[PDB]
C-alpha cells in the first residue's frame, strides 16, 4: 500500500516528497524523493570564482547559514595555505556557534511543531530573530550573510556587537530552559519521541550519519573534538552524546548542544584578540576600501580579487566541519584556475535522509514526521 | 535484552515513597502542569511583536537591501564603467555597457541590475572602487509586475539620490570597516 | 513552582539593548589591516602562501621497489600501528565551572 506522504506543514519542510509503502498504519518502507530542491549548485560553482562561489554555501543549508561558508572557507584555505588571524578564527567560531544555536533553535522547535507543540516554535523564533540581529548587524543580510570569506572573514564586527551578544548569552540559558521545560518533561513528548527512530551505532556509521545522529547512538564523534579546525582546540565545551539513539536522545543532545554552543559563544566573547580581521596576504584577501583607494598596489589586488580571484593552486581536499546538521564537508577539487573544479558538497541530510528508510520502518505513519524532524532534514543540502 | 533492560529500569524505581512519587507525577499530570504554568507566564508577559507598517525591525548600516547607484555630491554619476561589479556579481544581475560621453569621461550607457536575478550579497558594493553601487536600506520595493523589478539602466538605480541621505550616513558609519 | 530559580529573571524583553544604534559613530573603529611588522616591510615571497610551497613529487613505483619494501617490512611491531581515537562517555550534570561559563 503506497502513500504519497508530502510536505505536511509547508514552509517548515519544504519539498519533502516521501513515497511511503505502508502496512495499515505501520510503515514498511519510506522512499524519499530528492531533486525537488536540486538547484544546480554543484554545477554553478564550477562556473564562478572562489569568491562568487561563497554565497551558494549560505544557501546550501538555509537554517544554519554561516556553518557552510565556514566549511567552504576552510576548503579554500586548506589549498591556499592561507593562515587567518586569531580574531578571524574567534569571530568565525562565534558565528559558526551562533549558527549552531540558530539551527538547533529551528530544528528543535520546527520538529516540535511537526510533533504538535506550537509554542516552542514561536519562542525559539523570537530567539532566532534576536540572533539575526547579529547576523544582519555583522554582515548585512539576516539569513544569507556572505560573511566568512576564504581569507579570514568579510569585515570586522561593529563596535557594539560583543556587548549585545553578551546581553543575549546571559538571557539564553533561560530560553533553552523554557524550550526544555515545555518539551523535555512532557509525557506527550517522551511518548512521541522515546524509542522513535532508534539508530544502533553500527547503522549510524554505515549510513554515514556523522552529526547529532552519530552522537545519539553513542559514537563520541564531533569534528570539533576530532579535527579541531579553529580555536576549538582552545575553547572548552563538552559534546553531549546519547545513550539510546532514539529521537528523544537526539532532542536532548540538540538541547544540550544548544548550551555548549552557549559556552563557546561566551568564551569567544570573553577571549577575542584585537587583531587583523582578514589574512594579511592581500592576494587572497581584498584590501580594505581605505587602502585600495590610497595604495596603487592594493587597488590592483582589489581589482584582480573581485574580478579574477585567487587562483588557488591545483589540489583536491575534503574539508569537513561540524555543521549543525552534521558533518558538512565540501570536497573541493581545484584546477589551478581562479574557478573551482567540481566543488562537491557532502551535505548531511543527503546521508541522513537516506536513514529515513530504515529509521522509520515499522514506525507509525505519524512518526514519519518525527523522524524527518530529528534528522534536521533541510532540502537545500539534498 | 530490551526485556531485561525494562525489568531493570523498572527495578531502579522500586522503593515505596518513590513509586508513590512517580505515581503522583504521572497521575496528577505534574510534568504537564509545569508546561501549563510556563505557558501562562508567557500568556501574561509583554508580547515581542511589531505592528509592522508603523514600526519596523532593527537593521544595521551594513544591511543589504535595494541597490542604488550613488552620485558624487556635485552630480556626476559616481559609476565610472569599470564593470568590476558586473564581474563580481555571482548571479550576473548587472549588465553594464560603457561609452565615452561627449565630456570625454567614461560612463555607463547601460547599468541594469536585474533585482529578480540578484542575490543581494553586497559583492557589488565591495567590488565597486568609488562606492558607485551601494545597497540602500530600502528592502521595501515589492513590485506588482516582474518587468518593473528589473531595475533599468542607470535611471531607477539613480533613485538612490533620494536614499543618499541614508546611504551617505550608512557609508560614513561603515567606512571605518 | 516552575523554571524560575531567581535565574529566569534574565528575561527575554531587554528594553536596554543596542543602546548605541549601529550607524551612530560614537567611537570610530580602526580594524587593523596588516600587522605592524608588515607595513613598511612588504617583501612577499617570504610571506607568500599561495605559491610558496614545495612542488608535487610524483615518482613511480615499479614492482622491484614494492617487493623490496615488502621484504624490508620484517615485522609489524607495536607503534607501527595507527593509534585509536579513544573516547568514552561519562555522565556529568553541571560540574564544568558550576553551570557558569
Amino acid at each position: 500500500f503506497t502513500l504519497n506522504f508530502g510536505p505536511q506543514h509547508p514552509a517548515a519542510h519544504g519539498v519533502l516528497r516521501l513515497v511511503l509503502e505502508m502496512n495499515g498504519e505501520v510503515v514498511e518502507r519510506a522512499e524519499p524523493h530528492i531533486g525537488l530542491l536540486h538547484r544546480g549548485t554543484e554545477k554553478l560553482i564550477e562556473y564562478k570564482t572562489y569568491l562568487q562561489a561563497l554565497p551558494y554555501f549560505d544557501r546550501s543549508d538555509y537554517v544554519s547559514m554561516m556553518a557552510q561558508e565556514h566549511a567552504y572557507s576552510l576548503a579554500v584555505e586548506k589549498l591556499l595555505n592561507c593562515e587567518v588571524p586569531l580574531r578571524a578564527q574567534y569571530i568565525r567560531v562565534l558565528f559558526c556557534e551562533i549558527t549552531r544555536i540558530l539551527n538547533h533553535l529551528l530544528a528543535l522547535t520546527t520538529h516540535a511543531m511537526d510533533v504538535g507543540a506550537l509554542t516552542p516554535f514561536l519562542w525559539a523564533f523570537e530567539e532566532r530573530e534576536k540572533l539575526l540581529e547579529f547576523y544582519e548587524r555583522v554582515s548585512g543580510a539576516r539569513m544569507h550573510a556572505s560573511f566568512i570569506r576564504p581569507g579570514g572573514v568579510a569585515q570586522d564586527l561593529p563596535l557594539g556587537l560583543c556587548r549585545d551578544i553578551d546581553s543575549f548569552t546571559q538571557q539564553f540559558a533561560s530560553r533553552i530552559d523554557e524550550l526544555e521545560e515545555m518539551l523535555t518533561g512532557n509525557r506527550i513528548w517522551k511518548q512521541r519521541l522515546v524509542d522513535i527512530g532508534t539508530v544502533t551505532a553500527q547503522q549510524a556509521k554505515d549510513w554515514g550519519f556523522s552529526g547529532v545522529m552519530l552522537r545519539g547512538p553513542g559514537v563520541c564523534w564531533d569534528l570539533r573534538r576530532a579535527a579541531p579546525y579553529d580555536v576549538y582546540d582552545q575553547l572548552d565545551f563538552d559534546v553531549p552524546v546519547g545513550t539510546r539513539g532514539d529521537c528523544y536522545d537526539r532532542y536532548c543532545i540538540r538541547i544540550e548542544e544548544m548550551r555548549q554552543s552557549l559556552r563557546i559563544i561566551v568564551q569567544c566573547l570573553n577571549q577575542m584578540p584585537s587583531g587583523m580581521i582578514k589574512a594579511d596576504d592581500r592576494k587572497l584577501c581584498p584590501p580594505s576600501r581605505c587602502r585600495m583607494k590610497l595604495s596603487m598596489e592594493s587597488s590592483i589586488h582589489h581589482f584582480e580579487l573581485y574580478t579574477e580571484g585567487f587562483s588557488v593552486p591545483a589540489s583536491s581536499t575534503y574539508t569537513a566541519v561540524e555543521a549543525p546538521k552534521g558533518e558538512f564537508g565540501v570536497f573541493l577539487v581545484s584546477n589551478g584556475s581562479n574557478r573551482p573544479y567540481r566543488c562537491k558538497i557532502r551535505a548531511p541530510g543527503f546521508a541522513h535522509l537516506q536513514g529515513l528508510d530504515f529509521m522509520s520502518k515499522h514506525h507509525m505513519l505519524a512518526d514519519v514526521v518525527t523522524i524527518i524532524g530529528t534528522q534536521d532534514i533541510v532540502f537545500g543540502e539534498v | 535484552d530490551d526485556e531485561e533492560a525494562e525489568q531493570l529500569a523498572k527495578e531502579i524505581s522500586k522503593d515505596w515513597s518513590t513509586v508513590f512519587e512517580r505515581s503522583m507525577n504521572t497521575l496528577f499530570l505534574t510534568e504537564m502542569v509545569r508546561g501549563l504554568s510556563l505557558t501562562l507566564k508567557y500568556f501574561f508577559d509583554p508580547k515581542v511583536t511589531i505592528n509592522y507598517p508603523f514600526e519596523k525591525g532593527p537593521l544595521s548600516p551594513r544591511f543589504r537591501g535595494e541597490h542604488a547607484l550613488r552620485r558624487y555630491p556635485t552630480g556626476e554619476e559616481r559609476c565610472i564603467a569599470c564593470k568590476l561589479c558586473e564581474a563580481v556579481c555571482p548571479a550576473q544581475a548587472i549588465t553594464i555597457e560603457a561609452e565615452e560621453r561627449e565630456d570625454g569621461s567614461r560612463r555607463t550607457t547601460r547599468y541594469d541590475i536585474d533585482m529578480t536575478k540578484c542575490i543581494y550579497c553586497g559583492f557589488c558594493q565591495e567590488a565597486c572602487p568609488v562606492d558607485a553601487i551601494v545597497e540602500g536600506p530600502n528592502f521595501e520595493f515589492a513590485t506588482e509586475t516582474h518587468e518593473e523589478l528589473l531595475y533599468d539602466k542607470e535611471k531607477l538605480l539613480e533613485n538612490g539620490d533620494r536614499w543618499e541621505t541614508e546611504i551617505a550616513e550608512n557609508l560614513r558609519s561603515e567606512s571605518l570597516y | 513552582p516552575c523554571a524560575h530559580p531567581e535565574y529566569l529573571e534574565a528575561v527575554p524583553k531587554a528594553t536596554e539593548y543596542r543602546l548605541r544604534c549601529p550607524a551612530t559613530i560614537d567611537e570610530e573603529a580602526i580594524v587593523p589591516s596588516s600587522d605592524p611588522e608588515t607595513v613598511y616591510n612588504i617583501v612577499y615571497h617570504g610571506r607568500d602562501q599561495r605559491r610558496n610551497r614545495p612542488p608535487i613529487r610524483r615518482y613511480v613505483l615499479t614492482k622491484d621497489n614494492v617487493v623490496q619494501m615488502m621484504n624490508e617490512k620484517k615485522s609489524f611491531d607495536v607503534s607501527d600501528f595507527p593509534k585509536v581515537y579513544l573516547t568514552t562517555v561519562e555522565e556529568d550534570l553541571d560540574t564544568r565551572g558550576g553551570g557558569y561559563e
Binding site: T184, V194, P240, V241, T243, C252 | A9, I12 | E90
Partner: peptide
Amino acid sequence: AAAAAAAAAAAAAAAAAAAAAAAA
C-alpha cells in the same frame, strides 16, 4: 501487526558528555 511497537520505557535521563571534561 507484529511490528515492533515503540516502547516508551527507557533508562532515566543522565547527561552523558565525553571524557574530555577536565583534562581531555
